[PDB]
Write an enzyme that holds these catalytic residues in place. Structure first.
Site, PDB file in Angstrom:
ATOM      1  N   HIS A 469       0.811  -1.208   0.000  1.00 47.92           N
ATOM      2  CA  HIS A 469       0.000   0.000   0.000  1.00 47.92           C
ATOM      3  C   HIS A 469       0.846   1.259   0.000  1.00 47.92           C
ATOM      4  O   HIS A 469       0.311   2.350  -0.197  1.00 47.92           O
ATOM      5  CB  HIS A 469      -0.937   0.008   1.200  1.00 47.92           C
ATOM      6  CG  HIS A 469      -0.233   0.140   2.509  1.00 47.92           C
ATOM      7  ND1 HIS A 469       0.123  -0.948   3.273  1.00 47.92           N
ATOM      8  CD2 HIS A 469       0.171   1.231   3.196  1.00 47.92           C
ATOM      9  CE1 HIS A 469       0.723  -0.533   4.372  1.00 47.92           C
ATOM     10  NE2 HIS A 469       0.765   0.786   4.350  1.00 47.92           N
ATOM     11  N   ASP A 519      -0.708  -7.734   1.576  1.00 49.96           N
ATOM     12  CA  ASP A 519      -0.095  -6.414   1.503  1.00 49.96           C
ATOM     13  C   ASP A 519       1.402  -6.537   1.760  1.00 49.96           C
ATOM     14  O   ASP A 519       1.917  -6.183   2.815  1.00 49.96           O
ATOM     15  CB  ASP A 519      -0.759  -5.476   2.504  1.00 49.96           C
ATOM     16  CG  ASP A 519      -0.241  -4.073   2.417  1.00 49.96           C
ATOM     17  OD1 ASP A 519       0.471  -3.761   1.448  1.00 49.96           O
ATOM     18  OD2 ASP A 519      -0.550  -3.272   3.317  1.00 49.96           O
ATOM     19  N   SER A 642       4.602   2.157   8.889  1.00 47.63           N
ATOM     20  CA  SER A 642       3.975   1.204   7.991  1.00 47.63           C
ATOM     21  C   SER A 642       5.023   0.533   7.124  1.00 47.63           C
ATOM     22  O   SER A 642       5.981   1.165   6.683  1.00 47.63           O
ATOM     23  CB  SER A 642       2.947   1.910   7.116  1.00 47.63           C
ATOM     24  OG  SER A 642       2.036   0.986   6.560  1.00 47.63           O
TER      25      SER A 642
END
Length: 702
Positions: A469, A519, A642
């Site tokens: 992402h 992901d 992230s």
DNA sequence: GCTGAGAATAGAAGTAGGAGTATGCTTGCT
């Protein structure tokens, strides 16, 4: 004897463990916190447990750790000045007119209640010996530094002094004894610190070396208090520890005579330094692997060591003044009953002719190391037994026997390579990226939308693992910039490979905005990476490297690695976070046992997820969950954290088990909700893709 | 003008201005 009921013994934000036949209990809290008001409690004869006084309190709590204030700092100043300092609070030192500063002058309150770096000292040279300095939290009485002078060190109330409380300026210019420090009850040493501070002061730096004498020898005596958790499971953990110790000491080209002693109440002697095979390392190892069990009496063990030392006649044997003696004592109790064992140490020092001269003090010929395990260890007796040498540490206190194993695992892993995955040697002068060399920062400058900042992991010399992402197809290769080793230079990308089963566009016409299944992304660098003290790879699941890290046989299946790294438990993981250009290790727990569904259930507080019927349509089997307030107050992830690796710290090595994917609420730079969970991609579920894409990186996938 | 008993983060008893693995003393009666 009789036991107590556990009605209400739990601690706010922590756990506990019953030692000594359930008659005692220790409180364990999360990183940075300590259990308040007391760490331990025993069962009374009245059925109830010890009261918690600070003023009786009903229940216990975990509370944040503070680092002490410098009681005084001679010949200079420090700031910011405050009575106590929170964690990760820096303090700087300067000295007065015409003085010279040594030691770290930019110290920082670590997560363990200790200050980073070493003691700052401002000295000029106006004395025979050097300015011994004031370790933070202590108090020095004496300021005259001429020959034969003394300086005395005191600890605050409620704290135990480890080291020397009286140091004399010896002939020379070096001080006697060792620099003292004040120890709280909950204070434990990390296996990294123990490994480094034992290796150093066992050896000297030219790699290291063991400094014997011409026609000299070394006798090493391993004493084990096998009356408690040490001698459990037939000394299994201690067996591993001592095997690795023997191997590591043999790797230095020395052949020492070994003696091996266990003791519960009487000393059992397995190997004596007089046997001709006492220097055969593997004979000693085979004799060690076959020790067995079977009130704790230590003086008898030290007297067995002394009998080994003592000679068969009045006339001396040859080469008595050339042998160097090392006494490694591992205990977890040591309430010194059966006698006072210090007298044995004094008799030993008498026998070696140590401390009986001024030109020949002979302090190099006797080293005593003590490893205490558990909270029930007497921090005073172990420090009285051990030795005190300048710039050397000989007393250690660790949490379990598992940490004691990890100590010697780390010691063995020291000089293997820079390609050893997941290896970090905690040094004396280490910066941030020294401690997380696998880290990689990804920056994507998106037009009209927030600059995406992600993290990554260097899994090989050409690859970096991150989360998908972070990227899009709009983002051209000239907007993605990767940085490793903390260097300004950005790297050159060949191709960014996304998982073939990834799509954030859902499940979009089904009413779910973001679908983070699969992901994971792999950045292939154009050039190669040069492994060093700042760039190093991280271990991956179901590779032979991780099998060798987990100290497992080569005939181990990927499923065994799973049930060793990710069991149905509350696995203690960790990750790394950006905090004002600094890399901090945040320690979390993966709810994979009975709390897993409770973790996944809190995904409905997430954006666009408040009306999803089935929560298993957004939290797929490819996800691990951390966060919450049970069983501990987990820290949360940042928007910039992230893509970073979700690491498990086992056998002194770092194995990546997940990729940080998303979070329920974004509150990171911080009262915080209890539904604030974080979800990561389980790397065991995306294994075929990893194997297919990294087949030519020498990772030896299982 | 005393305290021969109990308290106290455990907790015996002796009698101690005691000791104690993070600390480390008072009753009541005149």
């Amino acid at each position: 004897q009789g036991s107590c009921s556990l009605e209400g013994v739990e601690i706010k934000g922590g756990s506990f463990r019953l030692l000594q036949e359930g008659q005692a209990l220790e409180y364990v809290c999360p990183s940075g916190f300590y259990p308040y008001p007391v760490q331990t409690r025993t069962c009374r004869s009245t059925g109830s447990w010890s009261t918690l006084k600070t003023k009786t309190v009903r229940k216990a709590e975990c509370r944040a750790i503070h680092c002490p204030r410098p009681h005084d700092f001679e010949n200079g100043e420090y700031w910011p000045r405050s009575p106590y300092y929170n964690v990760s609070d820096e303090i700087s030192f300067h000295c007065y007119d015409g003085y010279t500063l040594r030691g770290s002058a930019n110290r920082t309150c670590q997560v363990n209640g200790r200050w980073s770096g070493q003691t700052a000292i401002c000295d000029n040279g106006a004395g025979y010996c050097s300015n011994p300095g004031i370790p933070i939290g202590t108090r020095k009485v004496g300021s005259q530094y001429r020959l034969e002078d003394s300086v005395t060190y005191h600890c605050s109330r409620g704290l135990t002094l480890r080291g020397s409380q009286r140091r004399t300026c010896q002939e020379g210019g070096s001080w006697s004894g060792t620099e003292p420090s004040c120890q709280d009850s909950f204070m434990y040493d990390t296996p990294q610190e123990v490994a480094e501070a034992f290796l150093s002061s066992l050896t000297e730096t030219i790699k290291r070396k063991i400094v014997l004498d011409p026609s000299g020898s070394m006798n090493i005596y391993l004493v084990l208090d096998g009356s408690d958790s040490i001698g459990a499971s037939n000394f299994t953990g201690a067996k591993k520890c001592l095997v690795n110790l023997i191997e590591k000491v043999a790797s230095y080209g020395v052949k020492p005579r070994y003696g091996l002693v266990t003791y519960a109440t009487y000393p059992k002697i397995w190997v004596k330094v007089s046997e001709a095979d006492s220097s055969n390392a593997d004979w000693v190892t085979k004799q060690l692997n076959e020790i067995n069990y079977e009130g704790t009496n230590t003086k008898k063990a030290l007297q067995a060591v002394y009998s080994m030392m003592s000679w068969p006649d009045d006339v001396p044997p040859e080469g008595w003044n050339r042998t160097r003696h090392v006494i490694i004592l591992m205990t977890d109790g040591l309430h010194n009953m059966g006698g006072d064992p210090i007298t044995v140490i004094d008799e030993i020092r008498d026998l070696l002719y140590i401390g009986k001269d001024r030109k020949n003090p002979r302090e190099d010929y006797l080293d005593v190391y003590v490893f205490g395990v558990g909270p029930l260890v007497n921090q005073v007796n172990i420090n009285a037994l051990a030795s005190k040498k300048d710039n050397e540490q000989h007393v250690f206190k660790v949490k379990d026997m598992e940490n004691l194993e990890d100590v010697f695992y780390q010691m063995i892993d020291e000089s293997q390579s820079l390609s050893l995955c997941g290896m970090v040697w905690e040094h004396r002068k280490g910066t941030d990226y020294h401690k997380q060399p696998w880290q990689a920062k990804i920056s994507v400058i998106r037009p009209s939308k927030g600059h995406e900042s992600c993290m990554g992991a260097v899994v090989s010399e050409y690859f970096v693992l991150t989360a998908a992402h972070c990227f899009t197809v709009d983002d051209k290769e000239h907007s993605i910039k990767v940085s490793v080793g903390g260097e300004k230079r950005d790297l050159e990308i060949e191709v960014v490979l996304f998982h073939p089963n990834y799509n954030i566009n859902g499940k979009k016409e089904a009413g779910i905005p973001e679908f983070y299944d699969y992901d994971v992304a792999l950045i292939k660098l154009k050039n190669k990476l040069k492994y060093g003290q700042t760039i190093r790879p991280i271990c991956l699941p179901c590779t032979e490297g991780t099998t060798r890290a987990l100290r497992l046989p080569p005939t181990t299946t990927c499923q065994q690695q799973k049930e060793e790294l990710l069991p149905a438990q509350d696995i203690k993981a960790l990750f790394v976070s950006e905090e004002e250009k600094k890399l901090t290790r945040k320690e979390v727990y993966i709810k994979n046992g009975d709390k897993k569904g409770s973790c996944e259930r809190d995904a409905q507080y997430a954006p666009g997820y408040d009306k999803v019927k089935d929560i298993s349509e957004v939290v797929t089997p490819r996800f691990l969950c951390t966060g919450g307030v049970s069983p501990y107050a987990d820290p949360n992830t940042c928007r910039g954290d992230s893509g970073g690796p979700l690491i498990v710290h086992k056998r002194s090595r770092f194995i990546q088990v997940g990729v940080i994917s998303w979070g329920v609420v974004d509150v990171c730079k911080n009262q915080v909700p209890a539904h604030a969970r974080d979800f990561h991609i389980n790397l065991f579920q995306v294994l075929p893709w990893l194997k297919e894409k990294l087949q030519d990186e020498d990772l030896g996938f299982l």
